[PDB]
Motif scaffolding. Sequence first.
Motif, PDB file in Angstrom:
ATOM      1  N   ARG H  27       0.878  -1.497   0.005  1.00  0.00           N
ATOM      2  CA  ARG H  27       0.170   0.428  -0.135  1.00  0.00           C
ATOM      3  C   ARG H  27       1.382   1.592   0.029  1.00  0.00           C
ATOM      4  NH1 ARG H  27      -4.516   2.214  -2.033  1.00  0.00           N
ATOM      5  NH2 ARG H  27      -5.683   4.302  -0.975  1.00  0.00           N
ATOM      6  N   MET H  28       1.599   1.631   0.834  1.00  0.00           N
ATOM      7  CA  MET H  28       2.960   2.392   0.719  1.00  0.00           C
ATOM      8  C   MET H  28       3.018   2.730  -1.066  1.00  0.00           C
ATOM      9  SD  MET H  28       6.250   2.789   3.159  1.00  0.00           S
ATOM     10  CE  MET H  28       7.424   4.686   2.541  1.00  0.00           C
ATOM     11  N   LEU H  29       3.528   1.839  -1.865  1.00  0.00           N
ATOM     12  CA  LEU H  29       4.284   1.624  -2.893  1.00  0.00           C
ATOM     13  C   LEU H  29       3.532   2.407  -3.400  1.00  0.00           C
ATOM     14  CD1 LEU H  29       6.630  -0.934  -2.405  1.00  0.00           C
ATOM     15  CD2 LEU H  29       7.546   0.876  -2.387  1.00  0.00           C
ATOM     16  N   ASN H  30       2.358   1.743  -3.583  1.00  0.00           N
ATOM     17  CA  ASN H  30       1.282   2.432  -4.553  1.00  0.00           C
ATOM     18  C   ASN H  30       0.746   3.905  -4.299  1.00  0.00           C
ATOM     19  OD1 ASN H  30       0.878   0.253  -5.321  1.00  0.00           O
ATOM     20  ND2 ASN H  30      -1.050  -1.283  -4.310  1.00  0.00           N
ATOM     21  N   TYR H  31       0.670   3.812  -3.316  1.00  0.00           N
ATOM     22  CA  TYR H  31       0.373   5.030  -2.148  1.00  0.00           C
ATOM     23  C   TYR H  31       1.447   6.300  -3.301  1.00  0.00           C
ATOM     24  CZ  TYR H  31      -1.232   9.492   0.126  1.00  0.00           C
ATOM     25  OH  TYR H  31      -1.750  10.576   0.761  1.00  0.00           O
ATOM     26  N   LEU H  32       2.430   5.772  -2.904  1.00  0.00           N
ATOM     27  CA  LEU H  32       3.663   6.480  -3.290  1.00  0.00           C
ATOM     28  C   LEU H  32       3.789   6.902  -5.420  1.00  0.00           C
ATOM     29  CD1 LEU H  32       6.380   5.362  -1.170  1.00  0.00           C
ATOM     30  CD2 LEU H  32       5.483   7.633  -0.882  1.00  0.00           C
ATOM     31  N   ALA H  33       3.199   5.716  -5.369  1.00  0.00           N
ATOM     32  CA  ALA H  33       2.984   6.068  -7.485  1.00  0.00           C
ATOM     33  C   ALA H  33       2.646   7.281  -7.686  1.00  0.00           C
ATOM     34  CB  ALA H  33       3.216   4.621  -7.665  1.00  0.00           C
ATOM     35  N   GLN H  34       1.002   7.321  -6.685  1.00  0.00           N
ATOM     36  CA  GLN H  34      -0.135   7.608  -7.135  1.00  0.00           C
ATOM     37  C   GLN H  34      -0.018   9.557  -6.595  1.00  0.00           C
ATOM     38  OE1 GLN H  34      -3.750   6.189  -6.894  1.00  0.00           O
ATOM     39  NE2 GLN H  34      -3.506   4.314  -6.627  1.00  0.00           N
ATOM     40  N   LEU H  35       0.400   9.485  -5.624  1.00  0.00           N
ATOM     41  CA  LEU H  35       1.330   9.965  -5.127  1.00  0.00           C
ATOM     42  C   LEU H  35       2.142  11.182  -6.061  1.00  0.00           C
ATOM     43  CD1 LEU H  35       1.765  12.334  -2.864  1.00  0.00           C
ATOM     44  CD2 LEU H  35       2.871  10.831  -2.237  1.00  0.00           C
ATOM     45  N   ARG H  36       3.453   9.851  -7.087  1.00  0.00           N
ATOM     46  CA  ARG H  36       3.672  10.908  -8.015  1.00  0.00           C
ATOM     47  C   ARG H  36       3.465  11.503  -8.942  1.00  0.00           C
ATOM     48  NH1 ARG H  36       7.935   7.515 -10.410  1.00  0.00           N
ATOM     49  NH2 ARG H  36       8.561   7.319  -8.318  1.00  0.00           N
ATOM     50  N   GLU H  37       2.233  10.695  -9.819  1.00  0.00           N
ATOM     51  CA  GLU H  37       1.083  11.601 -10.177  1.00  0.00           C
ATOM     52  C   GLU H  37       0.035  12.910  -9.879  1.00  0.00           C
ATOM     53  OE1 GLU H  37       0.968  10.626 -13.382  1.00  0.00           O
ATOM     54  OE2 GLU H  37      -0.344  11.566 -14.006  1.00  0.00           O
ATOM     55  N   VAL H  38      -0.017  13.043  -8.889  1.00  0.00           N
ATOM     56  CA  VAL H  38      -1.043  13.511  -8.025  1.00  0.00           C
ATOM     57  C   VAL H  38       0.030  15.182  -7.801  1.00  0.00           C
ATOM     58  CG1 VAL H  38      -2.061  14.783  -6.083  1.00  0.00           C
ATOM     59  CG2 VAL H  38      -2.558  12.962  -6.520  1.00  0.00           C
ATOM     60  N   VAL H  39       1.365  15.206  -7.689  1.00  0.00           N
ATOM     61  CA  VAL H  39       2.222  16.172  -7.514  1.00  0.00           C
ATOM     62  C   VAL H  39       3.251  16.623  -8.668  1.00  0.00           C
ATOM     63  CG1 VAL H  39       3.709  16.818  -6.264  1.00  0.00           C
ATOM     64  CG2 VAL H  39       2.579  15.471  -5.254  1.00  0.00           C
ATOM     65  N   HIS H  40       3.247  15.882  -9.392  1.00  0.00           N
ATOM     66  CA  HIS H  40       3.483  15.431 -10.732  1.00  0.00           C
ATOM     67  C   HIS H  40       2.346  17.380 -11.433  1.00  0.00           C
ATOM     68  CE1 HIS H  40       5.768  15.592 -14.602  1.00  0.00           C
ATOM     69  NE2 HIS H  40       4.452  15.089 -15.090  1.00  0.00           N
ATOM     70  N   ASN H  41       1.567  16.523 -11.481  1.00  0.00           N
ATOM     71  CA  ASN H  41       0.107  17.572 -12.531  1.00  0.00           C
ATOM     72  C   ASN H  41       0.253  18.543 -11.615  1.00  0.00           C
ATOM     73  OD1 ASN H  41      -0.168  15.750 -14.238  1.00  0.00           O
ATOM     74  ND2 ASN H  41      -1.183  14.474 -12.479  1.00  0.00           N
ATOM     75  N   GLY H  42      -0.633  19.750 -11.741  1.00  0.00           N
ATOM     76  CA  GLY H  42      -1.416  20.530 -11.026  1.00  0.00           C
ATOM     77  C   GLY H  42      -2.233  20.385 -10.080  1.00  0.00           C
ATOM     78  N   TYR H  43      -1.448  20.215  -9.076  1.00  0.00           N
ATOM     79  CA  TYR H  43      -1.871  20.014  -7.487  1.00  0.00           C
ATOM     80  C   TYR H  43      -1.772  20.479  -6.700  1.00  0.00           C
ATOM     81  CZ  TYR H  43      -5.319  17.385 -10.731  1.00  0.00           C
ATOM     82  OH  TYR H  43      -6.683  17.358 -11.955  1.00  0.00           O
ATOM     83  N   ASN H  44      -0.995  21.725  -6.867  1.00  0.00           N
ATOM     84  CA  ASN H  44       0.085  22.081  -5.580  1.00  0.00           C
ATOM     85  C   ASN H  44      -1.094  22.812  -4.717  1.00  0.00           C
ATOM     86  OD1 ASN H  44      -0.609  23.962  -6.359  1.00  0.00           O
ATOM     87  ND2 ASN H  44       1.497  24.902  -7.399  1.00  0.00           N
ATOM     88  N   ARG H  45      -1.763  22.872  -4.343  1.00  0.00           N
ATOM     89  CA  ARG H  45      -2.898  23.269  -3.432  1.00  0.00           C
ATOM     90  C   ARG H  45      -3.283  22.847  -2.606  1.00  0.00           C
ATOM     91  NH1 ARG H  45       0.254  26.385  -4.085  1.00  0.00           N
ATOM     92  NH2 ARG H  45       1.127  28.799  -4.667  1.00  0.00           N
ATOM     93  N   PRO H  46      -3.621  22.404  -1.285  1.00  0.00           N
ATOM     94  CA  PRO H  46      -4.833  21.582  -0.933  1.00  0.00           C
ATOM     95  C   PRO H  46      -6.266  21.302  -1.883  1.00  0.00           C
ATOM     96  CG  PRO H  46      -3.919  22.900   1.131  1.00  0.00           C
ATOM     97  CD  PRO H  46      -3.701  23.644  -0.570  1.00  0.00           C
ATOM     98  N   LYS H  47      -6.723  20.480  -1.826  1.00  0.00           N
ATOM     99  CA  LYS H  47      -8.522  19.680  -2.208  1.00  0.00           C
ATOM    100  C   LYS H  47      -8.777  18.364  -2.456  1.00  0.00           C
ATOM    101  CE  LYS H  47     -10.276  20.341  -7.268  1.00  0.00           C
ATOM    102  NZ  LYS H  47      -9.794  19.961  -8.202  1.00  0.00           N
ATOM    103  N   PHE H  48      -9.964  18.508  -1.464  1.00  0.00           N
ATOM    104  CA  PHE H  48     -10.219  17.168  -0.912  1.00  0.00           C
ATOM    105  C   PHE H  48     -11.057  16.269  -2.925  1.00  0.00           C
ATOM    106  CE2 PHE H  48     -13.241  14.368   1.402  1.00  0.00           C
ATOM    107  CZ  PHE H  48     -13.675  13.919   0.173  1.00  0.00           C
ATOM    108  N   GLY H  49     -10.671  15.195  -3.243  1.00  0.00           N
ATOM    109  CA  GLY H  49     -10.714  14.791  -3.874  1.00  0.00           C
ATOM    110  C   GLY H  49      -9.617  14.313  -4.552  1.00  0.00           C
ATOM    111  N   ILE H  50      -8.263  14.292  -4.711  1.00  0.00           N
ATOM    112  CA  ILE H  50      -6.938  14.184  -5.611  1.00  0.00           C
ATOM    113  C   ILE H  50      -6.670  12.647  -4.919  1.00  0.00           C
ATOM    114  CG2 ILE H  50      -7.074  16.206  -6.252  1.00  0.00           C
ATOM    115  CD1 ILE H  50      -5.176  17.171  -4.803  1.00  0.00           C
TER     116      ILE H  50
END
Lengths: 50, 37, 37, 35, 49, 49, 99, 50
Positions: H27-50
């Motif tokens: 779960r940690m590795l899967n979370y980090l992989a999809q974390l990369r995608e969220v921060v790589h894309n334009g989500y540098n501010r707090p938001k619910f649902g990302i």
Amino acid sequence: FQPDLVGDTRNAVIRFDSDDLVVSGDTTFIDGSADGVINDLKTAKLSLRL
Amino acid sequence: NYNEKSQRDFRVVTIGYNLAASRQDEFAERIYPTTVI
Amino acid sequence: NYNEKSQRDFRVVTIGYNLAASRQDEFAERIYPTTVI
Amino acid sequence: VSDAEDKNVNLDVGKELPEQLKDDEDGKVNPCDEV
Amino acid sequence: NPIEGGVVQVLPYIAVMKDVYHEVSGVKMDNEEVNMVEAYRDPSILDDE
Amino acid sequence: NPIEGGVVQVLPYIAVMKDVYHEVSGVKMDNEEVNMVEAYRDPSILDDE
Amino acid sequence: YDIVSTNNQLFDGKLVVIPTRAVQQENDILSWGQFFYVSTVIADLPITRGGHQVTREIAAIPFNLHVNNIPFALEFKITGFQKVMGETQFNGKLADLKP
Amino acid sequence: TDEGPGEVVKALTVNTNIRNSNNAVKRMLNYLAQLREVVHNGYNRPKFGI
């Protein structure tokens, strides 16, 4: 060697049984050659478990 | 016989085998502390 | 091992083996009585 | 359906090792001693 | 006992062997070996000249 | 001891078995069997879906 | 900071840096993630699986979830230990400049 | 067998406990992989649902 449990107490028996016996492209024959099966194993990137 | 050499009975030693595990490993516990539900 | 049915330990029975003979068996002692020389 | 005591589990398979394997095969005879 | 599940019968005896040398191309040791108990019925197995 | 003449090493372990049936024409059973100890390095051997 | 190590085959050659609360409480949202665990049950019943044989099956049925709270993480892929500690790294270069 | 399983039931719990540790890593590795995608894309501010 293992003792033979049935029969003369002085009988010793060997039961060699190996499913991992390995032949690959790296090995050679007793005469030092590496041809035929071994050459084709090396070319095809294969190995055998005899 | 002429020579026996005593090839039937040998010394037997038992190798230990003791598996262990906590609810989850310390590595997992430090990252994901356990909460009981 | 689903079924640990005994395979190695057995009840071991070692039978007797007693050989005997007189200097001459009775059949031959009665026919040829022994005289010590 | 009892709860497991999972918190800290310690196995000992040696205690469960069958008595047969705690010693060697016992058929051994010194023929010179028996005759 | 259920833990035993069988028996082993050990039969020690004294054998009468001939004085026989090993052959260099023999398939077996040609030494006629007989249990001495046979001599009681047929003692000639013990005869030596 | 000169009578013991050697040692026998007995290795108990817990085996992780794949749940499979015997194959009618099988040459050997395809049940993968691995030591539970392997799971400490590679615990994926224990997972199933 | 603190150092926590694993030998999981999956976590091979990886360094990840994550925050946690200095003092851990209970179900503390400030822990990087939670492990929500429900007691595991051991089920014992002689199920006659297959319709022609009976076996006593003892099953351990888990019931738990891992949840992430904090999106912060730093991931470092660290390789080449044998290249810098094995092969020469300074004088090798001077040889490479040799014409 | 009327002796019961003995002390080998613990092996089922040890198996389960090891799987729990592996689930944390998966779960940690899967979370980090999809974390990369969220921060790589334009989500540098707090938001619910990302």
